[PDB]
Ligand binder design. Structure first.
Ligand SMILES: NC(=O)N/N=C(\C(=O)O)C(F)(F)F
Ligand SMILES: NC(=O)N/N=C(\C(=O)O)C(F)(F)F
Ligand SMILES: NC(=O)N/N=C(\C(=O)O)C(F)(F)F
Ligand SMILES: NC(=O)N/N=C(\C(=O)O)C(F)(F)F
Ligand SMILES: [Mn+2]
Ligand SMILES: [Mn+2]
Ligand SMILES: [Mn+2]
Ligand SMILES: [Mn+2]
Lengths: 339, 345, 342, 340
């Protein structure tokens, strides 16, 4: 009574294959370690600096990403006294129903699903970027792919559609990096507050080891978890909403910190991310220590592409690079003000 | 990695449980007949009502089997009006933390004796199917289905994972029909998207019956439907059914629904499923053909009790959501059967 | 790669056959007690003879169980003289090619339903042990022992594999005592060489109960010994035992032998096993204390038959065996020869 | 488990194959070599096949020093000798001992077998990428999946010619395989294994993924005998003649590889030159049945026991030095010119 609806089953490389081929260098290992220890500090109250997770919405061209990482690394070491810069290196995309799920799931973007390649491309891109000294951040959607990338990851996000799901709260509970939970698409805070609490508890569940086998896995629990404001049916980045989310966090016994995502439902329109910036910057300038981080969808070329132009996102519309240089400067100064 | 991964333990692969507990001939009949029976209802070629009914969670095989024996007697007595499937749920999703079900923690004490769990779960599923009674479950975990899916005639994606891509993927290659719940706030769109997503073929990483990860390709599942489970308010009434029916048609899908009488549709008041039932029976007996199914939370004894006390538990009583007891369950099933008869006619 | 490999098919992992067919308590006691009794015979502290006796190969579980029932009766009746251990050999090695046993081709038709074979083999092994009769097998390949070795109270390494590093490694990790047969030349050297190696600890690649390759480290097996099985000519005579007693001291291991009444020692004539028995008995009845064991090819029905129709019940389709009547007489002769040595 | 002490984990072949893929180059080294040994084996190349190199490999630097020297001779004697280097990673013992690089890469009994494979696959990949074919003993059942794609010719140990699992292995190997006569210096055991290895088999093995599987093989037609001596050597044109008839009687081509070392050598490494003279006389005398030759050679003559180690010197069987090696191969190349 098995596998009427399973078409084909193809061999998949275990993580140790991707680990052996592409070990972490000394630089990669250290970039990761330090950014993780930093975001801990910024999260336990002991750094006025602002974490800036920024980069494209999805990666499809490893050359464009390599160029972007080049540029962003300049301002990372430039603004290091106010900002903690981390690059958006997003290989998995959650679809409302149907479509391209990203570089790992379909690297050639032709529904060829040469996943084994996608795992090579992604791991090498992630390793090279960490070797620059640029730390990386991704969304953890699949339960199996993290074993190939998690050691190259300084920070992670759970997507708005899976924030309530127990299997992702289990995953978060065992990641060695800090984790952020987006509010519900229904705008509200509670499912992300439950998720933080769930992901801080020890969990025991079924996962796949570095060998590609199934096993029983115990996790310690992840205390480095925080909310990510992303908007609802209307945006929720305003100074009213922050204070709302602070009380809500204090009620639920959790640190009153927040990361505001300039994009998605918070900009309804990529240009609007810039208006969120001033609004949010006014708050950070005007003594608002509750904002511990920010999320921006930025690429080389602004705008959006569909299914082929260079350095332009094929998923969400991003701000181009000129705008990106401006935005990172407003942030480091809002931080300068607060300090 | 493994900074926050405390400990790793060996897990029996699916083929081990399958070899230890193969479907008997009758068990496999039960699974095969129930799936086609449901598929026929979903296609509109049967005026009968699918009824998924039983404990919120299984924590004691002894009372699970006592309950299955009583349900099977009614399933045979009423089979011209109802297609009775017992809730046999081994996975429980929590708002934050708590007991995640019999598989994850069979002895109910954070021993996490998962191999035992799979052994107890599959033997129980086997015993119930061999007896003639089909089983339903929530598909919550990405790895447990390989151990149990061939003894499952129907599954549910829970309200907290309906929007989850991996859950929509899992349903697209499941052998059985699958119901998708509206969102914990009462949102119909997530579930309709879920049905469309699950109807489509997918390609994604999963774990095989050999316990090894692999690239799997699915054909899509056509036997998917919405479940109305309440939001802020209940959404079982005529008014809401009409909205869901219209929104299915507007999305190009058959306008048919299963209504859960429990959870938010009862405001978590177990006796209120008797009132959801009265209203829903009247809709059916009055001519509503879109109600193809209902779900009820039922046990041997009504109410519930809490593991977390530390006392030894009463027999045959839920340790999760409160359920109606057996006497109410028998009456509910007869009303449902009677309403289906009246709809005929 | 794999220009000469045509197909790869899936293989049930050991843990799946251990879960379908777990040892019963009875079966596990059979293996525990038997393993222990043999180890005590092998170090001197028991004068009984160890008798490994049964079919050349199992091709039919039904006749095998009838054989076990009859053999079990005699195990009890002679237990003060004989430690009776049923030959349950699945895997068979061949000089050219041919049916490699029940595990490899249970349906005896070149279908290679190995999963079925392992299911049948473990089921049969489990039943025989569960009834109280301990079993002995040959270990030929490296992957199958995980599926069966927990129901094995004694083992043998093939005459064609006694010089094998891979086979001496395996013997070092086994929980049962293990005999090594002399070379097809009939020379004894490689046997002792193999008893020394198996006694040492080893580290080698092997498969786990999970069907995965892993690195394994073995303690080493000190319950090993030679099996005399002839060469160019039979080598069971008292003069031959003398030469091998002498060589076993020259190497510093206990001067003991198991004598195989079959194969080269009977010139491949199943009836001649009765003549080997008479000669060995007079050695035992002669005070020869260093003969610790015997191996007999025995079945319900003497002789053999070829594969082509239904077959004869209880009659070997590999090597010719003695039938039950001679089996009963030959075991009584061996018992009385034990009584005489005391 | 009573006699099992520990179960460490093990990279699956596909991990080694992925960190250390075959270069375009190394892929051609093996493709041509394999096809060359095949053409020589189908009686179709006046040339001899010398399998020459250390008894065992225990130092990848000393070893690729050796290799780069022997690549030159391969380039020079290219018209008389198909030269193949002896890259042996696994050693069968007569009881206990050091099983070679893979089992114990640091010779300290720590059994870092995961490093052993990494080291070994790196070495082979290099020697092959430079242009030089490789050869080894196939003793273990699990190791072949890490290394075989860089093996041009393989040998089955003399203490394993009679073992079913090794005949089974050879039936699936993609390279040609030689079978040593047994230690009893007798030839039937090898003749059987040649027939066995040519047939399809079906048996349990392990995949590139580290999983137990059921495997069917096609059979191996590129197999031959290796004369290795017994209680006395067997390289004589008399012994050769005896094997030729016995092999014709068996339906196999009368063809022979002569191993100059081990029992043929009286196990005295310097005698390999005596055997080399006498074997050359046969190749000179038009003898077409000697298709290949095996010699144990290293940078420096002799052997040593297990305190650090003399560079260049075998840790197992004593071998001849490099200059004796150079003269031996030109000795061999000349006799092929005479035959031609
Ligand atoms: N971080 C991302 O780009 N993801 N986008 C989202 C997701 O989680 O799907 C969103 F915030 F819109 F919900
Ligand atoms: N059947 C169950 O107990 N599940 N309950 C639910 C779930 O799907 O979690 C609910 F309906 F509340 F959404
Ligand atoms: N014990 C067996 O049945 N097999 N024994 C032999 C074999 O390898 O056939 C032997 F060589 F001893 F005759
Ligand atoms: N071929 C080698 O270098 N090792 N030695 C042998 C082998 O077993 O192959 C030998 F011939 F000595 F037995
Ligand atoms: Mn986006
Ligand atoms: Mn419930
Ligand atoms: Mn026999
Ligand atoms: Mn040597």
């Amino acid at each position: 009574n098995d596998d009427l609806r399973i078409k084909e089953i193809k061999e998949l490389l275990p993580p140790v294959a991707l680990l052996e081929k592409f070990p972490a260098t000394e630089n990669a290992a250290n970039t990761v370690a330090h950014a993780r220890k930093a975001i801990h500090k910024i999260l336990k109250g002991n750094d006025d600096r602002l974490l800036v997770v920024i980069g494209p919405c999805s990666i499809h061209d490893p050359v464009a990403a390599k160029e972007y990482a080049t540029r962003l690394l300049a301002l990372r070491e430039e603004l290091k006294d106010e900002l903690e810069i981390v690059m958006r290196v997003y290989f998995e995309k959650p679809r409302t129903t149907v479509g391209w799920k990203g570089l790992i799931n379909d690297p050639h973007m032709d529904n060829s699903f040469q996943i084994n390649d996608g795992l090579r491309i992604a791991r090498k891109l992630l390793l090279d970027i960490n070797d620059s000294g640029l730390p990386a951040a991704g969304e953890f959607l699949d339960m199996i792919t993290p074993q190939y990338l998690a050691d190259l990851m300084s920070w992670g996000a759970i997507g708005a559609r899976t924030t309530e799901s127990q299997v992702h709260r289990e995953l978060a509970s065992g990641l060695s990096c800090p984790v952020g939970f987006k509010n519900g698409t229904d705008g509200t805070i509670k499912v992300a507050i439950d998720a933080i609490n769930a992901a801080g508890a020890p969990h025991c569940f079924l996962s796949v080891t570095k060998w590609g086998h199934s096993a029983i896995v115990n996790t310690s629990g992840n205390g480095d978890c925080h909310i990510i404001l992303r908007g609802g049916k209307e945006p929720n980045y305003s100074a009213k909403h922050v204070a709302e989310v602070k009380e809500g966090l204090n009620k639920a016994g959790l640190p009153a910190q927040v990361m505001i995502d300039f994009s998605h439902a918070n900009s309804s329109q990529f240009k609007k991310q810039m208006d969120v910036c001033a609004d949010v910057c006014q708050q950070i300038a005007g003594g608002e220590k509750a904002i511990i981080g920010v999320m921006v969808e930025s690429h080389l070329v602004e705008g959006n592409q569909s299914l082929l132009a260079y350095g332009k996102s094929i998923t969400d519309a991003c701000i181009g690079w000129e705008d990106t240089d401006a935005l990172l400067r407003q942030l480091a100064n809002a931080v300068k003000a607060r300090r």
